[PDB]
A paper describes a structure:
In this study, we have determined the crystal structure of Ls-[name] in complex with DHβE, which is a potent competitive antagonist of nAChRs. The crystal belongs to space group P212121 with a DHβE molecule bound at the interface of all ten monomers in the asymmetric unit of the crystal. The binding pocket is formed by the highly conserved aromatic residues Tyr89, Trp143, Tyr185, and Tyr192 from the principal side of the interface and Trp53 from the complementary side. The protonated tertiary nitrogen of DHβE lies within hydrogen-bonding distance of the backbone carbonyl of Trp143 (2.7 Å, chain D) and is also in close contact with the hydroxyl group of Tyr89 from the B-loop (3.5 Å, chain D). On the complementary side, DHβE interacts with the protein main chain via a water-mediated hydrogen bond. The oxygen of the methoxy group of DHβE accepts a hydrogen bond from a water molecule, which is tightly coordinated to the backbone carbonyl oxygen of Leu102 and nitrogen of Met114. In this way, the antagonist DHβE bridges the principal and complementary side of the interface in a way comparable to that of agonists. The structure reveals three main features that are unique to this antagonist: (i) DHβE introduces a C-loop closure compared to that of agonists, (ii) the C-loop undergoes a conformational shift perpendicular to the previously observed C-loop movements, and (iii) the hydrogen-bonding network of DHβE is similar to that of agonists. Thus, DHβE seems to prevent receptor activation via a mechanism different from that of prototypical antagonists and toxins.
Neuronal nicotinic acetylcholine receptors (nAChRs) are pentameric ligand-gated ion channels present both in the central and peripheral nervous system. nAChRs belong to the Cys-loop superfamily and exist as homo or heteromeric receptors composed of either α subunits or α and β subunits in combination. The mulloskan [name] is a structural and functional homologue of the extracellular domain of nAChRs. The erythrina alkaloid dihydro-β-erythroidine (DHβE) is a potent competitive antagonist at nAChRs that has been used extensively as a pharmacological tool compound to gain a better understanding of the involvement of these receptors in physiological processes. Each monomer consists of an N-terminal α-helix, two short α310 helices and a 10-stranded β-sandwich core.
Numbering used by the authors:
A (entry chain F): 1 to 205
B (entry chain G), C (entry chain H), E (entry chain J): 1 to 155, 160 to 205
D (entry chain I): 1 to 155, 161 to 204
Write the structure that this text describes.
Amino acid sequence: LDRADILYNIRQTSRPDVIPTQRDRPVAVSVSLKFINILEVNEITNEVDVVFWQQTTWSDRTLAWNSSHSPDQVSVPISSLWVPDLAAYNAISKPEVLTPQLARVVSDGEVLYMPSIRQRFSCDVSGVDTESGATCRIKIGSWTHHSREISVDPTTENSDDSEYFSQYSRFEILDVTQKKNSVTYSCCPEAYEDVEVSLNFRKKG
Amino acid sequence: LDRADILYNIRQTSRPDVIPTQRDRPVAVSVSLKFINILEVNEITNEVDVVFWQQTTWSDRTLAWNSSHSPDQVSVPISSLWVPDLAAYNAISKPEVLTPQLARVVSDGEVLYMPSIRQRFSCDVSGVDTESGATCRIKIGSWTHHSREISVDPTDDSEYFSQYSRFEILDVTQKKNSVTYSCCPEAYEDVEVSLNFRKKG
Amino acid sequence: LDRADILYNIRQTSRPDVIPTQRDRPVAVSVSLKFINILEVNEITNEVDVVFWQQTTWSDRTLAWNSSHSPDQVSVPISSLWVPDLAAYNAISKPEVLTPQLARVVSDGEVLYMPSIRQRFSCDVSGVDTESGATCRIKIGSWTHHSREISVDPTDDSEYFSQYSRFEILDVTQKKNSVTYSCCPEAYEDVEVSLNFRKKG
Amino acid sequence: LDRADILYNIRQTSRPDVIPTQRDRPVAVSVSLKFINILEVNEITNEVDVVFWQQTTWSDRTLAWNSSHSPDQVSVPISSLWVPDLAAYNAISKPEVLTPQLARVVSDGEVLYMPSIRQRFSCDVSGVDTESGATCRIKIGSWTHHSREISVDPTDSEYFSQYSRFEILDVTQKKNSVTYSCCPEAYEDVEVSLNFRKK
Amino acid sequence: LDRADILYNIRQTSRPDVIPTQRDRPVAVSVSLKFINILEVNEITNEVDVVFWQQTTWSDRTLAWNSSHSPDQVSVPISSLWVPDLAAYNAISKPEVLTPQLARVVSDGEVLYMPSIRQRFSCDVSGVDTESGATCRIKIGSWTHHSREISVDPTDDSEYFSQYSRFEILDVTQKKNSVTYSCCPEAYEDVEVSLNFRKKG
Ligand SMILES: CO[C@H]1CC=C2CCN3CCC4=C(CC(=O)OC4)[C@]23C1
Ligand SMILES: CO[C@H]1CC=C2CCN3CCC4=C(CC(=O)OC4)[C@]23C1
Ligand SMILES: CO[C@H]1CC=C2CCN3CCC4=C(CC(=O)OC4)[C@]23C1
Ligand SMILES: CO[C@H]1CC=C2CCN3CCC4=C(CC(=O)OC4)[C@]23C1
Ligand SMILES: CO[C@H]1CC=C2CCN3CCC4=C(CC(=O)OC4)[C@]23C1
Ligand SMILES: [Mg+2]
Ligand SMILES: [Mg+2]
Ligand SMILES: [Mg+2]
């Protein structure tokens, strides 16, 4: 197989509308926000404007191919792939994607999609001008798929989600932590999972 | 049936431009606004900027399938479904959808669509800084389908309201109206949502 | 015929690129602006920001069907229909459509399309703070079709005007013009809508 | 032929990706800006916000039809036509098109396309508040086609809004040929000088 | 061959999703920024707003044709071509493309793509008001292709810079880097463009 064949095969047989589960085993999605720039902060309205790289990984075995004498990975337009329907629950603006909408697919079916996103959030900005800083929580999970269809999983301490933060920001990052949650909503009996990302930051000196 | 078959069947036989009226009864649509945030308020211009989850439900029996040895629900892109042509009659900005455009479909044909929407409204902001607060009315109904094609009915009032808003919700009431317009002999139904809110302490 | 058939037939045989001129008579288009809100006014720059419902009607006999054993009217996405290429000649922003892009089609081929539009205009704002008010003129006509292809005709001024606006409407008049442009020998029609309004208090 | 046949034929045989160079000759494009409004002006940043009608004409003989017992002209969505890849070289915002995207096509293959555009430009705003006024130059030409593929040629104050803060003193057009490092061939542009001032 | 044939052939056999690597050598991409304007600068937030022409060249031998009895070059919509997935790593707004999205393709398979882009960056603005000026670094490279798939290489600094800008360019230097990410073992290449500029007068 060459790249052209792999990409052709994926395009011709893609079901981007179909979550790649096998009932009742959920697709395990890992989500990790790499903060890049904090652009606007308003302590009066409790709103923040943020740029981050949304590292997103999951496995889709319908995409796998024999890697022998073939490339190990390809870049695929996300329009040809199923992609998890993640949403930021406390977002107050449309997510503005700043990067080419391509995912990286490995021959074993592992997918990495990492868009750079600019987006505005409603969160706690109180304390941003103090040395303790503000703690802004961003809640990300599947909009429509419950825990038996999509499970979302959180970084540990070992993930440094501030390692690409711009040195030229007015702001600086003190800490970034993730908390996994399961929530039940009135509409449905099943629980929905989310990752809660706590961004601890402050205005510099 | 597996998920892929259900979704394939729906996509291949979808008539998204066809209202699923059966027995000439109107399609019964339930609408309910869950307010999440109140972002900007202007008592001089009487304008408000709001984020809400628009809980929308109706039945489309053309989508039903067998719930034995099969999943009970699937997520479907709305581009493959008929969706009610609801509009907010006193909106002054385009509805900005903040969520993936997917609906949840149950095997009996019940559909739930619930986009998160940011939108600006012209409404009564007077009294926002008082104890009694302001009462802003939002009117939502079908743009083009009258009462014999679509009927609308309303379905913790701060259940999902952000604790970090400058504002707080005192009460939300959701009422049903029938209105006749000059163009048509028929009555058009809407839900009128009264949002009573005020600036925090 | 049922709804699904009518909509299928329209979609399958639609020529949205083709003006439905019958014989060599122009398509008669009626245009009428229902003002809903006046949101921003600037007397220094002579610009106004306005929300209106653009009531637009014309006949397309290629869409007609036998109304026996059939619905009387259907809602059709405008992408399946020819729609007149109307433009506001003194607009200074893109028209922002706030409503579902659907037209209402009667079995005799009558079409009604009525989007809610927010748009900014360059017009005379002088006198807005006086008792006489300002008179802002909005010029609407076909961008590319002359008077033998499209003719435009006008058809309570505050009927749907928001009671919460900073402004109020004194009068709305509509008159009809034919203009000849250097490019072409044929005349182009427009409707000129005069909005007489003033700041309250 | 009726209207529907002409439009069907055009749609079915349209090559909107293909410049209609006949006999190996450049397509002659005429460009003319009709200024309608001047909305914002900033003498500190040298930026101007402008609304204009971009009169654009050229010949595409692949579109011609026998006019006998047929309409002489039709309106065609530009998505069905080749259209010159004109750009404003000193623009600093995306062109915002305010009109239906239709061209007018005559039976001999002449095409007229005239969008109303609002766009922001970087140009010389100095002197806007004096009676000599400012002279803002707008440079428009093909982005990718050189002078043997597209040639541009010009062809006043007629539709300018009476309600603008500004007024037009004069509009002149010059025709330039420029060579760029990438290519040996010359690229043509029209330079439009807008002389205007505060009222 | 005529122009129409070349363009037809390219469109009919185009694989825009497929990087044109040959013999498992990376596609060599040349990137060069021609600065046209500096529109807004903020020394407090360290942000800059910039317009530049992104000169981008590479070879795609699948596009080559016999130039005998044929045009040497054509203009092709980029939607019909593979284009490198370059991104500005320190960009804080979406790239706003100001020019027709067309590339120039030579009969030997060389491609030149040069969009005019307006975009905002986070970079060092300190010293903009001094004689020494600020030095703003812009990092551009493939988003998803490593050094064995795409290699990037750089090619008057004020040549196309607008004479009417508040600012002036002192120097522009470009430098290739290889970076390894936690992501992946392979190294990713970028070009780092250093723009040394200052406030006029
Ligand atoms: C179809 O979209 C619905 C489908 C299922 C959901 C559970 C999680 N999700 C977001 C929050 C939310 C709901 C539904 C609800 O009742 O309230 C809030 C939904 C969106
Ligand atoms: C085609 O879209 C029209 C079709 C039918 C309607 C009934 C309610 N609806 C919104 C307001 C409104 C009208 C019709 C009208 O003339 O008055 C105002 C419409 C939209
Ligand atoms: C391409 O669409 C053209 C076709 C015919 C027109 C007459 C009315 N219309 C708007 C004003 C206007 C023109 C053309 C012209 O030369 O003057 C300005 C046009 C647009
Ligand atoms: C592919 O698009 C290129 C192809 C040919 C061009 C000459 C005119 N044009 C605009 C300015 C410009 C260039 C190319 C260049 O290197 O300098 C700047 C181009 C765009
Ligand atoms: C989906 O595209 C990913 C695939 C490979 C990459 C290396 C360069 N690139 C940008 C920054 C970046 C990553 C990957 C990563 O995990 O960290 C940061 C990527 C995007
Ligand atoms: Mg092969
Ligand atoms: Mg692995
Ligand atoms: Mg030939």
